[PDB]
Amino acid sequence: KIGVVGDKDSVSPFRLFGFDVQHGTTKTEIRKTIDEMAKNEYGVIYITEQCANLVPETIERYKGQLTPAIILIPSHQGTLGIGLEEIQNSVEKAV
Template sequence: MHRIGVIGDRDSVMPFKLFGFEVVYAIAGEQVRETIEAMAQRGFGVIFITEAASELATETIERYKAEMMPAIILIPSHQGTKGIGLKEIQENVERAVGQNIL
């Protein structure tokens, strides 16, 4: 079974510890990039990352989009959503189905 990681600011990702996920507080670009790389190398299956943190590591995230693992899922922070995660889902559905059904 693959592990699940969560990256972002403390207030947004702390609750994920309750589910047994590995949580890393990262708010600087280099921290976020290094954490994604480390989790990928350690065989994580899914990495949840806050939308704000994802903006600091766009190239790294783009590189893993073509890979089967890890799946990088954008989630809103405790301050609310920026719409980035929903946009990603809509684009993936459109690519898979041929049109936006959401």
């Protein structure tokens, strides 16, 4: 069970595979996607970083939960650098 969220051009290639691909653009309905993507047991969700600055709350909420495995990805243009952020504060928070 895999879902992906982002821009159609960059993400519709995932539809070749069995990925319930969305094209969400909203700040709250992106959560609404992810929330219906939460009560169905989709193991992993791929997210273009361009969509993640919209609804940052919802991936901090399920961050402590195993499912869904919320994953930030660059779109066809580029990432916003969510990798530089979250690996940096997470390593220092623990230690």
